[PDB]
Amino acid sequence: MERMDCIFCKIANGEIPSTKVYEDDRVLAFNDLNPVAPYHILVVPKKHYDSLIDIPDKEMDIVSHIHVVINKIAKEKGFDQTGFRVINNCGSDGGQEVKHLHYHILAGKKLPNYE
């Protein structure tokens, strides 16, 4: 379902404004407020999960659906052939700040390589 205090529940259900790039009955994709690349898009389920590690194994296909949507967005926006990065930050060490499952799509420039 949803969480009353969750900013991404409210963005996903339209109660807080965003710039939407894709929507279906299971997910919303919208531009990040603080982009780190020319494309910085968040893909979220409409159902609230706190984080990846909180999705039961039996429910993990939400992540596959998110990935079908990521590929659709990359093709539509013309960054599939140039390339892109997909990130999930889980919990404290992962750097998660908003506790509602989200995947970052970063594209439109050559991204840094971790060294």
Added chain:
Amino acid sequence: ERMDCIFCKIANGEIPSTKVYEDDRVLAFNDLNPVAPYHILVVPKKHYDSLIDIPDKEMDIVSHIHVVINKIAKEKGFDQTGFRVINNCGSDGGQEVKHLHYHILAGKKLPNYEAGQN
């Protein structure tokens, strides 16, 4: 399978690696050049060049990879401390090895690399 693919050779057991997970579909192994105390690569045994080369109807391999990630996290204890999952797709994504793989980084407070932190 691809002759020039390091990960096909690691997956079919032709090349040595340090194995973290294996089932009939997926292998996970330590990255040769780790950037965190846990730096694990999770790969299908089947070769796909990249995320965009997976047909929609086969995207369940990504869900299975994520079950594997969570299983490893729970075993190792970084379920509680946190972790990051990364896929690099194509040139600008920084993909080098053109065989679908996910990076798991864990075991330390990770920097926001794409925001410039190291």
